[PDB]
Amino acid sequence: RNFNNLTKGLCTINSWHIYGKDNAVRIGESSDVLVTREPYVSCDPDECRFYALSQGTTIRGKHSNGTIHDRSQYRALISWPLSSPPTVYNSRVECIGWSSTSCHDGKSRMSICISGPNNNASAVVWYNRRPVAEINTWARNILRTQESECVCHNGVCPVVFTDGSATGPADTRIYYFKEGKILKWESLTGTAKHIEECSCYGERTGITCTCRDNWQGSNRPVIQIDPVAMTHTSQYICSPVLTDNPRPNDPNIGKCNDPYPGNNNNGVKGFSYLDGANTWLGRTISTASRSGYEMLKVPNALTDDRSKPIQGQTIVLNADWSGYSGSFMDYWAEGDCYRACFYVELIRGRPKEDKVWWTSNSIVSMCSSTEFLGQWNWPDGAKIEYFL
Amino acid sequence: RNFNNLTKGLCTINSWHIYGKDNAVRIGESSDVLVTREPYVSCDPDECRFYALSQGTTIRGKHSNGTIHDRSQYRALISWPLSSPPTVYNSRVECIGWSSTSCHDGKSRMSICISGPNNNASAVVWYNRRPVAEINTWARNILRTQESECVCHNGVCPVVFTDGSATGPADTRIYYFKEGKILKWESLTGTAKHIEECSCYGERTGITCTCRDNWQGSNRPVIQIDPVAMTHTSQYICSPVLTDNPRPNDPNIGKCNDPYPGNNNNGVKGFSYLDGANTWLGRTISTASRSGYEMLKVPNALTDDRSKPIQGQTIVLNADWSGYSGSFMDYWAEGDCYRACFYVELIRGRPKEDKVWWTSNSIVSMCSSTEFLGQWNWPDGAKIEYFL
Amino acid sequence: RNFNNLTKGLCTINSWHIYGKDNAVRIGESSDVLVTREPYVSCDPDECRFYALSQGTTIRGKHSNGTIHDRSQYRALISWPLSSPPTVYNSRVECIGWSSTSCHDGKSRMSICISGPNNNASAVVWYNRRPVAEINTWARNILRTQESECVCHNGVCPVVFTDGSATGPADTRIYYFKEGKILKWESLTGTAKHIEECSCYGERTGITCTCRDNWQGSNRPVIQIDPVAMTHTSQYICSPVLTDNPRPNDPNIGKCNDPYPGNNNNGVKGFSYLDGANTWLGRTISTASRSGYEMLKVPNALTDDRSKPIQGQTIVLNADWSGYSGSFMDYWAEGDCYRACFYVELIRGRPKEDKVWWTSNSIVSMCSSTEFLGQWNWPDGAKIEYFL
Amino acid sequence: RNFNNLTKGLCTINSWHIYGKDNAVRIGESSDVLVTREPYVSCDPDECRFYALSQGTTIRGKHSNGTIHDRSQYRALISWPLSSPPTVYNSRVECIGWSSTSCHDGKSRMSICISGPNNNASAVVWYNRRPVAEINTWARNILRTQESECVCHNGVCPVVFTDGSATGPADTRIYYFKEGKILKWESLTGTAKHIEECSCYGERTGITCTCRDNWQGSNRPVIQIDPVAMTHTSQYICSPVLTDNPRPNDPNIGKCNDPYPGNNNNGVKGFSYLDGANTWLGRTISTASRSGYEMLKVPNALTDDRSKPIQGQTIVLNADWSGYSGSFMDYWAEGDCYRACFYVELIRGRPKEDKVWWTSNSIVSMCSSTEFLGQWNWPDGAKIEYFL
Ligand SMILES: *[C@@H]1O[C@H](CO)[C@@H](O[C@@H]2O[C@H](CO)[C@@H](O[C@@H]3O[C@H](CO[C@H]4O[C@H](CO[C@H]5O[C@H](CO)[C@@H](O)[C@H](O)[C@@H]5O)[C@@H](O)[C@H](O[C@H]5O[C@H](CO)[C@@H](O)[C@H](O)[C@@H]5O)[C@@H]4O)[C@@H](O)[C@H](O[C@H]4O[C@H](CO)[C@@H](O)[C@H](O)[C@@H]4O[C@H]4O[C@H](CO)[C@@H](O)[C@H](O)[C@@H]4O[C@H]4O[C@H](CO)[C@@H](O)[C@H](O)[C@@H]4O)[C@@H]3O)[C@H](O)[C@H]2NC(C)=O)[C@H](O)[C@H]1NC(C)=O
Ligand SMILES: *[C@@H]1O[C@H](CO)[C@@H](O[C@@H]2O[C@H](CO)[C@@H](O[C@@H]3O[C@H](CO[C@H]4O[C@H](CO[C@H]5O[C@H](CO)[C@@H](O)[C@H](O)[C@@H]5O)[C@@H](O)[C@H](O[C@H]5O[C@H](CO)[C@@H](O)[C@H](O)[C@@H]5O)[C@@H]4O)[C@@H](O)[C@H](O[C@H]4O[C@H](CO)[C@@H](O)[C@H](O)[C@@H]4O[C@H]4O[C@H](CO)[C@@H](O)[C@H](O)[C@@H]4O[C@H]4O[C@H](CO)[C@@H](O)[C@H](O)[C@@H]4O)[C@@H]3O)[C@H](O)[C@H]2NC(C)=O)[C@H](O)[C@H]1NC(C)=O
Ligand SMILES: *[C@@H]1O[C@H](CO)[C@@H](O[C@@H]2O[C@H](CO)[C@@H](O[C@@H]3O[C@H](CO[C@H]4O[C@H](CO[C@H]5O[C@H](CO)[C@@H](O)[C@H](O)[C@@H]5O)[C@@H](O)[C@H](O[C@H]5O[C@H](CO)[C@@H](O)[C@H](O)[C@@H]5O)[C@@H]4O)[C@@H](O)[C@H](O[C@H]4O[C@H](CO)[C@@H](O)[C@H](O)[C@@H]4O[C@H]4O[C@H](CO)[C@@H](O)[C@H](O)[C@@H]4O[C@H]4O[C@H](CO)[C@@H](O)[C@H](O)[C@@H]4O)[C@@H]3O)[C@H](O)[C@H]2NC(C)=O)[C@H](O)[C@H]1NC(C)=O
Ligand SMILES: *[C@@H]1O[C@H](CO)[C@@H](O[C@@H]2O[C@H](CO)[C@@H](O[C@@H]3O[C@H](CO[C@H]4O[C@H](CO[C@H]5O[C@H](CO)[C@@H](O)[C@H](O)[C@@H]5O)[C@@H](O)[C@H](O[C@H]5O[C@H](CO)[C@@H](O)[C@H](O)[C@@H]5O)[C@@H]4O)[C@@H](O)[C@H](O[C@H]4O[C@H](CO)[C@@H](O)[C@H](O)[C@@H]4O[C@H]4O[C@H](CO)[C@@H](O)[C@H](O)[C@@H]4O[C@H]4O[C@H](CO)[C@@H](O)[C@H](O)[C@@H]4O)[C@@H]3O)[C@H](O)[C@H]2NC(C)=O)[C@H](O)[C@H]1NC(C)=O
Ligand SMILES: CC(=O)N[C@H]1[C@H]([C@H](O)[C@H](O)CO)OC(C(=O)O)=C[C@@H]1NC(=N)N
Ligand SMILES: CC(=O)N[C@H]1[C@H]([C@H](O)[C@H](O)CO)OC(C(=O)O)=C[C@@H]1NC(=N)N
Ligand SMILES: CC(=O)N[C@H]1[C@H]([C@H](O)[C@H](O)CO)OC(C(=O)O)=C[C@@H]1NC(=N)N
Ligand SMILES: [Ca+2]
Ligand SMILES: [Ca+2]
Ligand SMILES: [Ca+2]
Ligand SMILES: [Ca+2]
């Protein structure tokens, strides 16, 4: 087969339909379902799969005790069939670590896992299920990457890494891989002041990443990557429709080249589709906690610092827990355009539900529709008392 | 490969032999078997599989509590290997929803799931395991479809949908799909007064659907579809051998173009094979509850309003619970004719067995034989007290 | 690919080496392992698999209570990977019933299951995982067949069936199938007075079946089938080395054309390889119960009514339970000769161990070696008290 | 496809990165994970897999009681997907026995299992998942082999066997197989005085085995095999950096042709990569017990009896249990050189943790990097109290 080429634009987004949901925590109440977090979705040319970071234990297993912990030697990036739960028996390990990305280039899949102690972490780059390249920490402060799929164009797969402080200036690098080999890496340029956990998608013939400013910003940093020239720019979403969490209330003027202030030293992984008038932003409903999720149609959110919603859709009720969210597309589907998709992580357990001693999640996933479809709300569905 | 063409007639039906049985509830007493309901069977050119709507939990799982509920965000259409139980680990999710159909066209499989709230439901059409088309509710009252396989001819797959009241006139549409794309849709024509949960099979070169009249009828509505012209007619089974449930006792004159009265606002999904003198009707043995199942040979049941049984076979004893039933065939088997098959849903738990708080089912499945084979009876086999 | 042709003779048998063992009961103490009985082994051209009749429940499942029962609607012929246990999740159902056979012809597999009540049982013949032919009971008294693999030559697969009394004259038929279709069937001819559960193997270019006389005989009936002419003969193993169970002590003169007396109305499925001086007989060590198993080299056992052992090998200690045993070969292995193989069923639970209320089994399997290898003993290995 | 040829040298080893870890004991606390020991890793041309000797029971299963036992009829060589746990459902049995090796030759896999009583054990050689050759015990004292992968060159796969005393002179043989057939076998030559459990790797165009001296030596025996000529030599690692366990403290002069004294009648399976200045030795950190693991860069360890470490990396903390370790490489990866890999067995339970009555293990696995990557430590991660 061939390297996939980003030759298509996004489909028109008039609503979102249900694409995938695994009900992991519901099922894992009485099945050998693996504790996970930081999930995402990524497609091969013949199959789409769920991904997450395992915690090396099942939910009912006693080792689930204390899995709010982010980084341990018992974590690993796993994938499993679409809308199935991540079980001990059906899960395929891609690589070992506690921060990851993964993407198919049309021929084979590249997966990257970061492992190690905070001051000595390292990334291993896997291609065609074999280890190919390794990158050592350059700032010795929790080397970390996207926690969602990367995008490939003609065999070139850009990945965004960050090494350094989570509450101040850090050292962010965009790496360009082909077949697992390092072609080139760049220091972060542009006006974005802090970069974490970029959510990327590809469209003719560029790659757009919506990331997390954990330092001072409640608006989201945007990195736009050219995968042919292997260059990039950065700024923020200009829109006053702020999409981080926690975050202040929406002003009437956003910020294009600086963080919008109000909430320091925190954030959540999130995403957006920036496509002129076809722009949709995702965010939690709450401005304080990781609860609820909605999609908002905000024309020219990227460049218009006055832009407001003209349409929207509720994905998760504010009364229900959410969490991380990120973008993905099936680049091998039929049609003239790429259908925009995303997932929402539904975190259950700690810190918000400390009656149990574990932290896991399930996945809900949506794709766009050119129809104006009715909306439902998609909660995790598990009842905590059952786990007591 | 090629699109399957309905070039064959039905085989002669002189009896029914055992084809499949999963013993799900028996096995699920001490295994991670998924709670399901509304099951069916559908074949690929190289494999036949069980299908059902999952409830997003195992039987022993505490979340099975309250699964008599029909529609929730935790349901999904799953398939699994023939005569295996639907387990957490061996089940493949086809799409997310609480009403479905699915069928192979010879090249790839089309699956359709409906999800959403009662006044805003929507169908997503999957083809080759990718979402292709979406249909929004047109009557805003539980958009719903067949709950058994559809039939394809030369790439054209007709599906029967209903939107609107379950106790009065509703808005029924026949959709014609090819490769997941909507070719055409039609409003329901003919003399059938209410349409739900059609059970279809294909024979040279038309498609016959036996459905459920939930309004006033205890005789079954029949839709006959021409998949080339993409047109249809409707009426009832003329036979006084009434095959819904609940239902009145068999009269000596049936009704061809109107519901036979006696039982309002209720029914069960059922099926028939209408083939002149090769006609076999299926039904529950009880006229009051979903218990028992039998096949009755009723010559010209479709057109003869005096027709009576001349042969029969017991499938499930009246002392045993049954439920939904529907038709399917292996259109890729060897031979000159299509062998008629069906399944019976064996519902266990609520409402009829309320010592437990769940509702699930297992599957028994039969196909026709040109031999006159001895009959057995096929109960679910699970003992409720074990679940207490 | 092509139909397999029996073009080779048996390899020289100088000992037996371990080939397969699943430890099902050991593992099933704390895993979802299916209760089974009547197991065997059968090879495809690219894989060899374990087979058995499931009881439709796991060992720990409460439904295992009463599985000493031979025939129920919850039984089915399952296969699973070599030396794995028969679990809920890894088992593939071949067909539904409580008596079976199965064999590959080089192109596809034919499986046959008998189901039904005692006076109305019927066999369904599956080929390439599709139902092809059906045979109704001709004597209305537990229609039953081999409970081990059949053998195919040039697409022709002979099967031995018996219908009628287990304690008197019965109606035995040899059926000849090709691609699941009935080519011909014959009434049992020769001097064998009672036929049950034949164990067959194929060698240039005939098929040899060693069966069970449940009526009066403690010597074993032998059917020799010509798969080209589609004809057969029958007699007993002439050897005074009696190989049924229960059985009298070995005399000095056996019987060639009549049952050797002493034990009526009982027996066990067993096997032999009859190959001139390369002859090996299998049997239980005990003459009273299904315990122990040994192979005995008895030159010309088939024709010499004075023949005695000149070599042997213990397979299972007399202190350990055994059960059914049968023959199989990999007809697609490399080499000039067919390597003789067999399995022993290790029955655990009732009737011999009635502290538990279930009956299951595990499998040990051996093949011949041209070396003179050391012997071990192969017990089931499960400790009953753990199940209490 | 073709026979793999050892045409490449080792890559430069500047550090080790994480390659695989299964967390079996953590996961097996609440999942059907098989009790194992003596694990290793071996690659096919399209997949790499974990291997181990099963104990025929799960960890939570009551039959895990007493699995410190080395040799029983319930053991078997199993393989399962990389970094998954060895579960009942995902494990593939390769052959039956309590001592093993296995390796792909580029076309198919050869697996060897030894079973039997101590004075009558025998090896069965499997090729392409079929039994091909058998070797009887020649010294009648626990016939035993490598417990890690073998290496093939042009279809020739050398295996090191030992039969005889574990505390004195034994009879060691190097067997040369092709497609499972015995080409030739040799008695052990050279200056190595005792040989057990060789860990081998292949490099242009020879095979290097690092073994265990269980008699008098705490330095490791090295066998170097020529797979074309089918000949070999033996000696010890000259280095004073002693790498057995238990072992004395490191002297300043090692031994090239005799055992370094201090610890009798004990040892552990271990490995090394001997490549001039690219030499790395593995060993436990403790000199007394199987705890901890480290890699040490020791230039010319094989020939220089004064050589000392100039670089190193901790793999497992001394406070954590280790166990067996062995070498493997992906001989089908891309590149100009072979990347050196190894695994460490992390033994949990008895004898060191006798609060539980079982003995199992999990696996950590590493490969080399030409980068100088930061190090972590990789413990098993299971907490014993959970199992009480
Ligand atoms: C079956 O399903 C269908 C399909 O899903 C359902 O229909 C959907 O219903 C939902 C819910 O109502 C809609 O989502 C909302 O959309 C509105 C935007 O639509 C309105 O505004 C448009 C823009 O108007 C402006 O510009 C135009 C320029 O021409 C001008 O005309 C106008 O006067 C004004 O100047 C209108 O164009 C639009 O009209 C169109 O749509 C109508 C249908 O809605 C139709 O009838 C019309 O004919 C026309 O076609 C419409 O009036 C979003 O604004 C809204 O999002 C806000 O509200 C939710 C709360 O519900 C909140 O969570 C959001 O975050 C957002 O509110 C925050 O952000 C604002 C901007 O920063 C801020 O000002 C707010 O104060 C608020 O801020 C606070 O909350 C946030 C959140 O925590 C916090 O962060 C802040 O700090 C602060 O605390 C919804 O997304 C769908 O659009 C609609 N879809 C369709 C296809 O109709 C249907 O209801 C279902 N049926 C049933 C029976 O249930
Ligand atoms: C081993 O296995 C074999 C194979 O399975 C077993 O053999 C099978 O046995 C079963 C059970 O007996 C049979 O099923 C029944 O079949 C009859 C129909 O067959 C009879 O009627 C035929 C038609 O006769 C009429 O027309 C001809 C025209 O020529 C005329 O000759 C005749 O005088 C009359 O005018 C006859 O042709 C037929 O004869 C043939 O078959 C004989 C074998 O049966 C053979 O001996 C003959 O030589 C000849 O070849 C035969 O006489 C069905 O009527 C019946 O179904 C009714 O009964 C069951 C109860 O058992 C009920 O559940 C059904 O729903 C149905 O009864 C309801 O419907 C009627 C119509 O509406 C109504 O009038 C009834 O009052 C009743 O209604 C009530 O109940 C329902 C249900 O709840 C409710 O909804 C209503 O409101 C109301 O309450 C059976 O299906 C198989 O046909 C037969 N198969 C074979 C191959 O033989 C064998 O027994 C097994 N062996 C052993 C040892 O067990
Ligand atoms: C490592 O592994 C190796 C390989 O496995 C082990 O070596 C094996 O050891 C076993 C056990 O000893 C052997 O099995 C037995 O074989 C004998 C037959 O071998 C003997 O007899 C041969 C025939 O002799 C006759 O004919 C020749 C003609 O030339 C003539 O020379 C001779 O005088 C006599 O006329 C001899 O050829 C043979 O010698 C050869 O082998 C020797 C090694 O064994 C070797 O040293 C010699 O040099 C020569 O090469 C040898 O003497 C079987 O008879 C025996 O089976 C009987 O006994 C067991 C009990 O152990 C019983 O269960 C069997 O069913 C059978 O006994 C019943 O059947 C008889 C016939 O009907 C009857 O007469 C008996 O009374 C008895 O009947 C009773 O019990 C049954 C069972 O319940 C019941 O049904 C009845 O009603 C009644 O109650 C064994 O199978 C292997 O052959 C041998 N293999 C090899 C390769 O050596 C080695 O031991 C292991 N090492 C260690 C350290 O453990
Ligand atoms: C992030 O990750 C990185 C990468 O992993 C981390 O960096 C790593 O850190 C580890 C731990 O410190 C290092 O491993 C140790 O390496 C030393 C060897 O390196 C030293 O020695 C070299 C040789 O020196 C000699 O020769 C040269 C010839 O030119 C000469 O110059 C010199 O004077 C001397 O003559 C030096 O070349 C080397 O310098 C280089 O490296 C420096 C960085 O380390 C760098 O700064 C320099 O500029 C230069 O480039 C360096 O000085 C090993 O010796 C050591 O292994 C011993 O110690 C451990 C305990 O920690 C022990 O377990 C080992 O078994 C071994 O000690 C035993 O064996 C000896 C030999 O038999 C014996 O003499 C000892 O007494 C001891 O024996 C006792 O214990 C054993 C064990 O139980 C027992 O069996 C005995 O019986 C007895 O009881 C370590 O392996 C890595 O090399 C290093 N890697 C890199 C790339 O830097 C970094 O730290 C991490 N960052 C953070 C913040 O954590
Ligand atoms: C490498 C790492 O630990 N990344 C963190 C992430 C991180 O702490 C923040 O972005 C601060 O830099 O926060 C969160 C979070 O829940 O907000 C999950 C991630 N956990 C994992 N990726 N395992
Ligand atoms: C969409 C929906 O909920 N369909 C119902 C169905 C429906 O209520 C009746 O046909 C009335 O219209 O009844 C029943 C039933 O048990 O009779 C199961 C179905 N459940 C599911 N398909 N999930
Ligand atoms: C065949 C056999 O039993 N090999 C032993 C091995 C052996 O005892 C020593 O090398 C002494 O010769 O020791 C050990 C050990 O834990 O040190 C595991 C092995 N267990 C297994 N391979 N099953
Ligand atoms: Ca922030
Ligand atoms: Ca009705
Ligand atoms: Ca008998
Ligand atoms: Ca030693």
Amino acid at A203: E
DSSP β-ladder status, C272-273 and B109-115 = unpaired
DSSP assignment of D197-240 equals EEEEEEETTEEEEEEE--SS-SSPEEEEEETTTTEEEEEE---S
User: How far is the C-alpha of A87 from the C-alpha of B88, rounded, in Å?
Assistant: 8
Instruction: Please report which ligand is nearest the Cα atom of A197.
Output: 5
Dihedral sign computed on CA atoms, order C132, C136, C138, C139:
positive
CB distance B140 to B151 below 8 Å: no
Instruction: Please report which ligand is nearest the Cα atom of A148.
Output: 5
CA triple D171-D174-D177, angle to 5 deg: 140
Selecting from D17, D26, D383 the residue whose C-beta is nearest the C-beta of A56 gives: D26
C-alpha torsion angle, residues D273, D277, D278, D284 (rounded to 10): 50
Q: Which residues of A touch D30 (CB under 8 A)?
A: 32, 57-58, 60-63
What are the φ/ψ torsions at residue D355 (nearest 5 degrees)?
-70, -30
Token pair of C258 as six digits? 């009549």
* C-beta B252 within 6 A of ligand 2: no
CB of C89 within 8 Å of any CB in chain D? yes
Selecting from C56, C60, C115 the residue whose C-beta is nearest the C-beta of B381 gives: C56
CB distance A149 to A329 below 8 Å: no
User: Which residues sit opposite B226 in a β-bridge?
Assistant: B231
Omega prior to B379 cis, within 30 of 0: no
Residue of A145, A91, A88 whose CA lies nearest to A115: A145
Mutate to test the pocket of ligand 2, among B238, B249, B250 (most ligand atoms within 8 A of CB): B250
User: How far is the C-alpha of D23 from the C-alpha of D2, rounded, in Å?
Assistant: 35
How far is ligand 3, taken at its centre, from the CA of residue C370, in Å?
A: 18
CA triple C106-C110-C116, angle to 5 deg: 170
**D153: Cα separation from own chain's centroid:** 19
User: How far is the C-alpha of D7 from the C-alpha of D329, rounded, in Å?
Assistant: 13
CB of C26 within 8 Å of any CB in chain D? yes
Reduced to 3 states, what is the DSSP secondary structure of residue C182? strand
Q: What stretches of A119-215 adopt beta strand conformation (E)?
A: 122-127, 130-136, 157-164, 170-178, 181-187, 196-203, 206-212
Amino acid at B353: E
User: How far is the C-alpha of A255 from the C-alpha of A213, rounded, in Å?
Assistant: 13
Token pair of A365 as six digits? 């996933």
Chain D nearest-CA distance from A152, in A, is 20
CB of B178 within 8 Å of any CB in chain A? no
Amino acid at D217: G
Reduced to 3 states, what is the DSSP secondary structure of residue D56? strand
CB distance A306 to A377 below 8 Å: no
Reduced to 3 states, what is the DSSP secondary structure of residue D119? coil
Token pair of D304 as six digits? 């220089």
What are the φ/ψ torsions at residue C137 (nearest 5 degrees)?
-55, 135
User: How far is the C-alpha of B20 from the C-alpha of B79, rounded, in Å?
Assistant: 14
For residue C33, the chain B residue with the least C-alpha distance is B31
User: How far is the C-alpha of B50 from the C-alpha of B19, rounded, in Å?
Assistant: 12
Q: What stretches of D237-357 adopt beta strand conformation (E)?
A: 272-273, 280-283, 291-297, 311-321, 325-328, 341-349
CB distance D266 to D280 below 8 Å: no
How far, in Å, are A13, A216, C377, D24 from residue C22 at the CA level? 55, 61, 15, 21
Token pair 């003459």: residue: C287
Query: Which residues touch D354 (CB under 8 Å, ≥6 apart)?
Result: none
Residue of C276, C266, C258, C284 whose CA lies nearest to C345: C284
**B51: Cα separation from own chain's centroid:** 11
Sheet holding B15-21, edge to edge: B15-21, B359-369, B341-349, B325-328
Q: Which residues of C76-86 are buried (b: 16+ CB within 10 A; e: fewer)?
A: bbbbbbbbbbb
Instruction: Please report which ligand is nearest the Cα atom of B167.
Output: 6
CB of B374 within 8 Å of any CB in chain C? yes
Token pair 């001895």: residue: B374
Chain D nearest-CA distance from C55, in A, is 19
CB distance D176 to D230 below 8 Å: yes
**Ligand 2, atom 81, residue with closest C-alpha:** B285
CB of B30 within 8 Å of any CB in chain A? no
How far is ligand 9, taken at its centre, from the CA of residue B357, in Å?
A: 27
State which H helix or E strand residue B69 sits in. Answer: none
Annotated catalytic residue, options C70, C226, C258, C304: C70
Burial of A321 (0-12, 13-18, 19+ CB in 10 A): buried
DSSP state of D156: B
Q: What stretches of C64-139 adopt beta strand conformation (E)?
A: 76-81, 92-96, 99-104, 109-115, 122-127, 130-136
CB distance D155 to D139 below 8 Å: no
* Active site (catalytic) residues of B: 70, 324
Q: How was this structure determined?
A: X-ray
Give chain B's radius of gyration (CA, Å).
Answer: 19
User: How far is the C-alpha of C341 from the C-alpha of C343, rounded, in Å?
Assistant: 7
CA triple B323-B325-B326, angle to 5 deg: 160
Terminal CA-to-CA distance of chain B, rounded, Å? Answer: 51
Mutate to test the pocket of ligand 3, among C253, C310, C315 (most ligand atoms within 8 A of CB): C310
Q: Which residues of A104-136 are buried (b: 16+ CB within 10 A; e: fewer)?
A: bbbebbbbbbbbbeeeebbbbbbbebbbbbbbb
CB of D81 within 8 Å of any CB in chain A? yes
CA triple A330-A332-A333, angle to 5 deg: 75
Token pair 């999800």: residue: B115
D1-388 has which fold? Neuraminidase (2.120.10)
CB distance D85 to D28 below 8 Å: yes
How far is ligand 4, taken at its centre, from the CA of residue D315, in Å?
A: 14
User: Which residues sit opposite D235 in a β-bridge?
Assistant: D222
How far is ligand 9, taken at its centre, from the CA of residue B195, in Å?
A: 10
Token pair of D141 as six digits? 């004292």
Reduced to 3 states, what is the DSSP secondary structure of residue A25? helix
User: How far is the C-alpha of B244 from the C-alpha of B231, rounded, in Å?
Assistant: 26
User: How far is the C-alpha of D47 from the C-alpha of D285, rounded, in Å?
Assistant: 32
**A129: Cα separation from own chain's centroid:** 22
CB distance D166 to D189 below 8 Å: no
Query: Which residues touch A14 (CB under 8 Å, ≥6 apart)?
Result: A368, A369, A370, A371, A372
For residue B16, the chain C residue with the least C-alpha distance is C134
User: How far is the C-alpha of C176 from the C-alpha of B385, rounded, in Å?
Assistant: 46
Q: Which residues of C touch B31 (CB under 8 A)?
A: 32, 58, 61, 88
What size, in residues, is chain C? 388
CB–CB of B62 and A29 under 8 A?
yes
User: How far is the C-alpha of C48 from the C-alpha of B197, rounded, in Å?
Assistant: 43
Q: Return the biggest CA–CA distance within chain B.
A: 55
CB distance C142 to C134 below 8 Å: no
What are the φ/ψ torsions at residue A96 (nearest 5 degrees)?
-100, 130
DSSP β-ladder status, A130-136 and B47-58 = unpaired
Reduced to 3 states, what is the DSSP secondary structure of residue D338? strand
Query: Which residues touch C76 (CB under 8 Å, ≥6 apart)?
Result: B21, B23, B83, C53, C54, C56, C93, C94, C95, C96, C97, C113
Query: Which residues touch D6 (CB under 8 Å, ≥6 apart)?
Result: D151, D153, D202, D203, D204, D205, D206, D207, D227, D331
Reduced to 3 states, what is the DSSP secondary structure of residue A24? helix
At how many Å resolution was this determined? Answer: 2.4
For residue C35, the chain B residue with the least C-alpha distance is B27
State which H helix or E strand residue D26 sits in. Answer: helix D24-27
CB–CB of C83 and D61 under 8 A?
no
* C-beta B375 within 6 A of ligand 2: yes
**Ligand 5, atom 6, residue with closest C-alpha:** A70
DSSP assignment of A43-94 equals EETTEEEEEEEEEEEESSSGGGTTTT-S--TT-EEEEEETTS--BTTT-EEE
What are the φ/ψ torsions at residue C278 (nearest 5 degrees)?
-95, 25
Reduced to 3 states, what is the DSSP secondary structure of residue C228? coil
User: How far is the C-alpha of B14 from the C-alpha of A15, rounded, in Å?
Assistant: 52
Token pair of D385 as six digits? 């109290």
User: How far is the C-alpha of A76 from the C-alpha of A95, rounded, in Å?
Assistant: 6
CB distance A344 to A325 below 8 Å: yes
User: How far is the C-alpha of A77 from the C-alpha of A56, rounded, in Å?
Assistant: 10
Token pair of D362 as six digits? 């999990």
CB of A62 within 8 Å of any CB in chain B? no
**A109: Cα separation from own chain's centroid:** 18
DSSP β-ladder status, A47-58 and A34-44 = antiparallel
User: Which residues sit opposite C226 in a β-bridge?
Assistant: C231
How far, in Å, are A70, A123, A134 from residue A119 at the CA level? 15, 13, 16
DSSP state of B332: T
Burial of D298 (0-12, 13-18, 19+ CB in 10 A): buried
Residue C306 annotated as binding site: no
What size, in residues, is chain D? 388
Domain extent listing, chain D = 1-388
Query: Which residues touch B144 (CB under 8 Å, ≥6 apart)?
Result: B99, B114, B121, B161, B162, B163, B196, B197
User: How far is the C-alpha of C366 from the C-alpha of C346, rounded, in Å?
Assistant: 14
Annotated catalytic residue, options D273, D324, D338, D343: D324
Q: Which residues of A touch D334 (CB under 8 A)?
A: 128, 130, 132, 179
Sheet holding B181-187, edge to edge: B157-164, B170-178, B181-187
- B23 — alpha (psi -120 to 50), left (phi > 0) or beta? left
How far is ligand 4, taken at its centre, from the CA of residue D313, in Å?
A: 8
How far is ligand 9, taken at its centre, from the CA of residue A240, in Å?
A: 56
Residue of D232, D116, D126, D125 whose CA lies nearest to D173: D232
D70 is catalytic: yes
Chain B nearest-CA distance from A73, in A, is 26
Token pair of D173 as six digits? 């043989």
